[PDB]
Design a protein around this nucleic acid. Sequence first.
RNA 1: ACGGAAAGACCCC
RNA 2: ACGGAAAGACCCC
Lengths: 709, 709
Amino acid sequence: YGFNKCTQYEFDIHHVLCIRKKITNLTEAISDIPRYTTHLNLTHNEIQVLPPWSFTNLSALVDLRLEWNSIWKIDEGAFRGLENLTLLNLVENKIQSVNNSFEGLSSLKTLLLSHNQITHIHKDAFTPLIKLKYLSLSRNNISDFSGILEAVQHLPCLERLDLTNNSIMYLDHSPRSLVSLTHLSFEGNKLRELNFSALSLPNLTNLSASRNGNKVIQNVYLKTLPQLKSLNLSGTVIKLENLSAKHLQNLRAMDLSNWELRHGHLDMKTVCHLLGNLPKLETLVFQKNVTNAEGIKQLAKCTRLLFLDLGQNSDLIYLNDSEFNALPSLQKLNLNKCQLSFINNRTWSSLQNLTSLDLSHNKFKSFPDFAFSPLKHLEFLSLSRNPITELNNLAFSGLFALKELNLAACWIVTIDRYSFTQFPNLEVLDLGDNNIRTLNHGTFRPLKKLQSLILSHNCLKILEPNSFSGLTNLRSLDLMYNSLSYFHEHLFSGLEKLLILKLGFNKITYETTRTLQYPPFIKLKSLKQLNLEGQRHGIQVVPSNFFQGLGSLQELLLGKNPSVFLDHHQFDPLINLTKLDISGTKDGDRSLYLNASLFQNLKRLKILRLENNNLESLVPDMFSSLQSLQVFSLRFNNLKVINQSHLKNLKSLMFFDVYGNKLQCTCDNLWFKNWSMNTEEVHIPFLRSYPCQQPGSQSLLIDFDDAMC
Amino acid sequence: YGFNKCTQYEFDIHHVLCIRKKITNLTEAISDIPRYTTHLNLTHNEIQVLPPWSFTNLSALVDLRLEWNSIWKIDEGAFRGLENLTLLNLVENKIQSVNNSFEGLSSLKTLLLSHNQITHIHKDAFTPLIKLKYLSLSRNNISDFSGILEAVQHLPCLERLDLTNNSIMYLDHSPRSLVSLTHLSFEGNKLRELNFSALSLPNLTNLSASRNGNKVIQNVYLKTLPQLKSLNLSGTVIKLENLSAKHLQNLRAMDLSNWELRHGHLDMKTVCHLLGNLPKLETLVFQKNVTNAEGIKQLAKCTRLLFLDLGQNSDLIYLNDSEFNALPSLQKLNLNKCQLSFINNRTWSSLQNLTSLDLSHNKFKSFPDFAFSPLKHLEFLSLSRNPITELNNLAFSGLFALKELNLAACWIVTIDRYSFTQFPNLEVLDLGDNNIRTLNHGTFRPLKKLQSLILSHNCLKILEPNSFSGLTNLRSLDLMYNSLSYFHEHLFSGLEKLLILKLGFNKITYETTRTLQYPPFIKLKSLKQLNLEGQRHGIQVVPSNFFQGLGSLQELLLGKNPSVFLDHHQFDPLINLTKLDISGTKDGDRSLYLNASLFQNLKRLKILRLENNNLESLVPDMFSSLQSLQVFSLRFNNLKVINQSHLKNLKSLMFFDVYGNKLQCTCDNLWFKNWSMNTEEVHIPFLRSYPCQQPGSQSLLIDFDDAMC
RNA sequence: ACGGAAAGACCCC
RNA sequence: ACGGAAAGACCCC
Ligand SMILES: *[C@@H]1O[C@H](CO)[C@@H](O[C@@H]2O[C@H](CO)[C@@H](O)[C@H](O)[C@H]2NC(C)=O)[C@H](O)[C@H]1NC(C)=O
Ligand SMILES: *[C@@H]1O[C@H](CO)[C@@H](O[C@@H]2O[C@H](CO)[C@@H](O)[C@H](O)[C@H]2NC(C)=O)[C@H](O)[C@H]1NC(C)=O
Ligand SMILES: *[C@@H]1O[C@H](CO)[C@@H](O[C@@H]2O[C@H](CO)[C@@H](O)[C@H](O)[C@H]2NC(C)=O)[C@H](O)[C@H]1NC(C)=O
Ligand SMILES: *[C@@H]1O[C@H](CO)[C@@H](O[C@@H]2O[C@H](CO)[C@@H](O)[C@H](O)[C@H]2NC(C)=O)[C@H](O)[C@H]1NC(C)=O
Ligand SMILES: *[C@@H]1O[C@H](CO)[C@@H](O[C@@H]2O[C@H](CO)[C@@H](O)[C@H](O)[C@H]2NC(C)=O)[C@H](O)[C@H]1NC(C)=O
Ligand SMILES: *[C@@H]1O[C@H](CO)[C@@H](O[C@@H]2O[C@H](CO)[C@@H](O)[C@H](O)[C@H]2NC(C)=O)[C@H](O)[C@H]1NC(C)=O
Ligand SMILES: *[C@@H]1O[C@H](CO)[C@@H](O)[C@H](O)[C@H]1NC(C)=O
Ligand SMILES: *[C@@H]1O[C@H](CO)[C@@H](O)[C@H](O)[C@H]1NC(C)=O
Ligand SMILES: *[C@@H]1O[C@H](CO)[C@@H](O)[C@H](O)[C@H]1NC(C)=O
Ligand SMILES: *[C@@H]1O[C@H](CO)[C@@H](O)[C@H](O)[C@H]1NC(C)=O
Ligand SMILES: *[C@@H]1O[C@H](CO)[C@@H](O)[C@H](O)[C@H]1NC(C)=O
Ligand SMILES: *[C@@H]1O[C@H](CO)[C@@H](O)[C@H](O)[C@H]1NC(C)=O
Ligand SMILES: *[C@@H]1O[C@H](CO)[C@@H](O)[C@H](O)[C@H]1NC(C)=O
Ligand SMILES: *[C@@H]1O[C@H](CO)[C@@H](O)[C@H](O)[C@H]1NC(C)=O
Ligand SMILES: *[C@@H]1O[C@H](CO)[C@@H](O)[C@H](O)[C@H]1NC(C)=O
Ligand SMILES: *[C@@H]1O[C@H](CO)[C@@H](O)[C@H](O)[C@H]1NC(C)=O
Ligand SMILES: *[C@@H]1O[C@H](CO)[C@@H](O)[C@H](O)[C@H]1NC(C)=O
Ligand SMILES: *[C@@H]1O[C@H](CO)[C@@H](O)[C@H](O)[C@H]1NC(C)=O
Ligand SMILES: *[C@@H]1O[C@H](CO)[C@@H](O)[C@H](O)[C@H]1NC(C)=O
Ligand SMILES: *[C@@H]1O[C@H](CO)[C@@H](O)[C@H](O)[C@H]1NC(C)=O
Ligand SMILES: *[C@@H]1O[C@H](CO)[C@@H](O)[C@H](O)[C@H]1NC(C)=O
Ligand SMILES: *[C@@H]1O[C@H](CO)[C@@H](O)[C@H](O)[C@H]1NC(C)=O
Ligand SMILES: *[C@@H]1O[C@H](CO)[C@@H](O)[C@H](O)[C@H]1NC(C)=O
Ligand SMILES: *[C@@H]1O[C@H](CO)[C@@H](O)[C@H](O)[C@H]1NC(C)=O
């Protein structure tokens, strides 16, 4: 019970992976895999042909992925018997034309043919596909649209058709009807026309003709799409006068962005004449130097938007003059990637319905007092990627509804107890990737409802005691990628409800044996996940009482440390532990020590990963207490021998991974070789490929002369 | 030619190291080392006794170190025959009393007995020490100063005696004279008096009585130290009225700093009455809340200083009122670790002789225009560890004499081409550990004479083209610990005098085979040392022409990378290479690839370190071309066999390190065992300690059969 | 968040 | 700059 080229997924035997195995012969590779296989992933190999009965013994397949291969030839019959298949992925291969290879795929719901070199599809290729809802042909070499229509027009269930990034220049002009179709995309083609007369799409809600070339499109006819809800003309040069509001009375969303800033502002008179007559229009995406502040004022008259996106309007440098006041309907406003350096109380005085605002990636160094104060209903505010070194507390006065504040990748140099008084309802605060060096006491005291706090990728060295007081409801705390080293007595004081604590990639290191006067996690009584991966010089000597107080912990990650020494009984408090990972120390005895009886109390452990540690041997009876152990991985070590002793008492074992080791083809492994092939309870990854250590190779553990013992 | 517990130093055979080897029997440990040994270091062991002829076969010793052991017993005779020894280190042992050992130490210049538990020294212990110049008794349990004087007073050459950190409470009161003594320290004792009536030190130049407690010393008499040039009373409470200037007419330097800030300001009238009558006083160290600004003004009248140190004067918050004008003689001024947040050109208007100024570790967020402008002779300025996010360019107007600027560990968020206009003579610029994310073009253009630029530990991701334009004289560039990955076409252009480039601990990583259109080091015509260590994910696939143009290179550091893949002929340009380190990848085949003929051109390579790579095998003929190879280290790998094949053609070899491997006691290692024990041309570290791989151990490769082979 | 874990990857485009 | 290379370190004080 282990295959050659493929492995089962550890947490579902019905999923099979054969990824990056240089597979060239499809049939051989899958010949030894179970008949009960529902998901098979063969991504990233060198498969070239799909023969007439490729999946004979695999008729239970539901999901087949052949992404990133060299498939250029799929024989008729290839997918016969695959009547339960709902997904077929053929992305990134060498397919130039599509033939009648699809018989049997009577349940296929989605077919992905993106990223090939297709020019034509045979008229009858898709006939067996009576359930096909989604078809992707993006990234191909198609210029003949008539031929595609021939191939898809009779599909009974086809809802979404994607032709993005092809070479279609003209639409088709013989009368036809695709009645199931809801989504259609011509993005990134070279359309000269948008005349849909001869094409009836009664149920189309979403059309894209975005990014379609240099030549201006004048020939536009959309009457035949009466249900159309979103029209995407982003980066498409279209004479907007030839658009007709009469043909767009169901439109809810429009995208009129330029391709590049060079193209310049749109004529608001033209735009408003169109937009002003679309009574259902509520979303306008209006990007890339399409307008200035004054044009926003005009737009506000022509329209009644819920969502306006003004991103990448380079001529927006300040907004201080009632620009949005004729738009009180606004719920969501995006002003990201402009050139804004000043914004105040006068621009959005009347936006009392605004709940989401994106100001990220501008030139804000600061904001004046009461700038955001009219927005009494704001729930999401993003200021990410502004050159802000300091928070002007008064700019956020009265934002009592705010639930999420994103300040990631700003330049914030300091915060304190006065920084967040105005956000009593905040739930998520992202301070990641700033420049914060110390955390002062009470900095987050007002944030009574905070659920998630991100402080990662700062330069934190010093955490004052009571830094996190008031965070009674905090569930998640991310402190990854800082320079933290030791823990103060009352560091984690107010955090009794904390579920997740992430401290990986700091400098939490002990250079000698210690018994801490104050175990750092002692107050975290609800903690379920602890990350201590990759301390710069490894955690090294783990203090003997390091994990005291952590009886609720379920997952401990100590992987990627240069060294981890657990000499004593450090895991004794961890009675509810479910998953433990100590992988990647990379040179056994020097980098890893585990006391012989370290795992004794881990009677609920389900997962144990000790991979890439270059282990040379196993400690006797180390794992014998692990009753509930289901997944045991020793992948990428230097183990030479495994036997009944190592595996003693693992009653619940069902995945045991000893791939990437040095198992010797001698009698020492005779019990293992027979048991590993024969057990039906335990899966063993790539077992049938494990090579003999003999320098001559050309021989497998699996074929070991049993007779010699 | 290989020893058991010790090894020779790779670059001077006369140096022997025996560090952290758990040595307990000194004689046994040193029994196999050469008679030509001059430096012997046995630091960090558990040696307890030194028997009567411990160094019998080692009479050539000059430098002997027994630091960090458990020596409590040194027999009479221990150091016999050691007539060339000039240094003996016994620091950090268990010595409680010093007996009459030391016979034979007739050249000993320095004897270190610091960090023991010495209470007494026998009167005749140091009699053989006729050339002893320096004796350290710091960190011991000496309270009997009379007893110490008995032991040193007859030493004919004793110049320096250190008793810092002992328990001496009273001086001795029988008249004596140590005429050779120039330096004496009672720092960190518990002196209740400073009465030197009975102790004549006619040549004493330096006295420290620093850190002697709170109990105020009134009993002061120093007439007997007529040559005294420096008096250190830092942290010692002494009734300054009871000091006499009559007895201190040769004094050049004094330290009157407080112990803690609590002690408060000194009485400036008392201070000045003393100080004003010392005609040679040129250095005053004056720290820890000893004065305020106004006190500086009074001090300026009593004195004519060349160096004034006012560090840690917490009441110095602003200086804007002629504080220093009456001290125009100042050459060096330190004002670090005060609470300074404002300073301007009015405080130091007349300081035209100032050449060094330290403002580090204050609270400067900025400086006003022209603050530093009067200091026209300033050569050195430190502003380290101020919360400065941006440089006010006008604050430095006219500092044309400045040679070194230290801005390390400030909060600097941006600099540009206007940032360094005022420093045409700058030679060293330290910008490490700021918050700089991108480097703009022309940033260092004015610095025509710059030699060393430190930008380490910033957040550099983007280096604009021409970032280093104008740095034609640059010798050293430190860009370690940033986030660099790719370099613009001409980034390292114009740096043709660059000697040293440090790019370690960035993200310089290629995930596939590449042949770079523009190799980044191609213009570095003088580059001698290149550091590329520890890229976050390793350099991985080294581009085929990555080292193009580096024919002048002598040292290439590629260590500490998670992976290094050198598939082709990357090292072919490196014809002058002398040292190569690719250590610490940590798992042979997965993390390290070296083309079979990669070393073909390194005909001048002297040093090759391939350590800690978990290597299992050696590639045939990989090293056959290394004529000049002298040092070859394979320390800490998994090598099982070494033989004639590997060492083929290594004509210049003199050090071959295969310690920490897995060498098998079989016939495969017969050639190696015979060659390694017998060759006198090549040293092999710890050879006689190499154990047999049998799990029972208790056997050495050195004592291997031979009979069946 | 390549902070890859269905992980030890030459990861193309 | 433990950024330890006289290096793979339980590095105390
Ligand atoms: C191979 O295919 C499997 C499914 O057959 C992919 O599985 C998904 O994996 C992600 C995590 O990677 C999960 O969050 C999804 O729920 C999984 N989907 C299903 C249908 O199980 C798998 O990721 C693929 N792997 C690769 C490398 O291509
Ligand atoms: C119209 O089509 C454009 C062009 O594809 C869409 O742009 C993408 O939008 C997604 C989600 O916002 C981004 O993550 C992609 O990076 C965009 N791609 C490009 C090439 O810009 C645009 O979102 C569509 N407009 C609407 C309203 O759907
Ligand atoms: C601001 O939002 C509110 C709340 O969603 C809008 O009021 C609602 O409008 C719908 C449709 O007219 C009604 O059925 C609800 O009864 C209204 N709710 C309330 C609380 O009155 C309001 O129309 C929005 N304002 C603007 C300018 O569009
Ligand atoms: C052991 O003793 C030797 C001297 O015998 C020490 O050598 C010095 O090493 C430093 C660099 O670490 C050099 O810059 C000095 O020149 C060396 N001194 C001499 C006299 O050679 C060595 O550091 C000691 N090793 C340890 C770990 O204590
Ligand atoms: C004398 O004792 C003092 C005080 O203990 C020593 O000073 C300190 O040095 C330690 C050890 O490196 C540091 O951790 C402390 O920060 C220092 N404290 C103070 C008060 O400065 C001093 O080094 C000893 N002197 C000698 C020469 O042994
Ligand atoms: C007088 O003694 C003091 C206190 O012992 C010396 O202070 C030390 O100074 C050195 C050099 O600046 C520092 O590296 C140490 O941190 C200091 N040690 C302590 C314990 O403070 C002081 O330098 C001496 N004064 C003079 C004028 O030499
Ligand atoms: C794959 O292997 C089988 C078994 O040897 C062989 O019959 C068949 O020809 C191979 N198919 C391909 C694609 O070459
Ligand atoms: C399908 O299953 C049967 C039964 O094991 C087997 O004999 C047959 O060869 C299988 N077909 C292929 C091509 O794997
Ligand atoms: C379809 O048939 C043509 C012509 O026989 C062939 O070139 C092509 O490989 C086939 N396509 C696929 C993917 O099977
Ligand atoms: C379409 O083309 C553009 C340009 O390369 C690309 O960025 C985009 O991801 C492509 N979309 C698809 C679905 O292939
Ligand atoms: C289709 O249009 C609607 C708006 O009417 C939009 O919300 C939705 O995301 C669009 N779907 C796609 C996949 O373009
Ligand atoms: C908006 O900003 C500009 C530039 O600061 C200023 O001149 C103008 O008066 C402001 N507008 C109003 C009406 O406040
Ligand atoms: C608008 O800003 C001004 C000036 O900063 C402020 O005084 C005023 O209270 C603000 N108005 C409102 C309603 O928030
Ligand atoms: C160390 O070993 C030698 C010889 O094996 C022995 O004679 C000597 O007495 C030992 N020294 C000590 C201090 O135990
Ligand atoms: C010193 O060397 C002599 C002569 O080689 C040797 O016989 C003797 O054992 C050595 N003495 C000690 C104590 O190592
Ligand atoms: C002691 O030092 C001198 C000075 O170099 C040297 O010539 C002499 O040979 C040395 N003697 C010993 C004991 O090695
Ligand atoms: C000196 O002699 C004393 C008393 O006999 C003894 O306890 C001690 O070990 C000796 N000290 C040293 C360093 O030899
Ligand atoms: C110092 O000590 C001597 C005795 O040694 C004593 O007579 C004298 O009074 C003391 N000097 C002072 C200033 O107290
Ligand atoms: C001795 O004093 C002089 C100043 O007179 C000073 O330069 C030197 O550093 C001192 N030496 C020591 C070890 O303190
Ligand atoms: C400095 O001394 C003054 C009195 O001279 C005192 O008021 C103040 O507390 C001192 N500063 C500190 C930090 O102790
Ligand atoms: C110096 O600065 C302080 C604080 O800004 C100010 O109050 C004081 O008046 C200034 N004094 C002079 C002499 O300018
Ligand atoms: C300043 O330094 C010069 C040059 O060394 C010297 O001659 C002059 O006396 C100094 N001026 C004062 C006031 O010390
Ligand atoms: C001192 O600074 C003031 C204020 O910046 C400036 O006006 C003046 O020119 C400066 N004086 C000198 C001589 O540096
Ligand atoms: C390398 O070394 C030689 C001899 O030391 C020197 O003359 C030459 O300039 C160097 N070659 C290069 C490529 O810089």
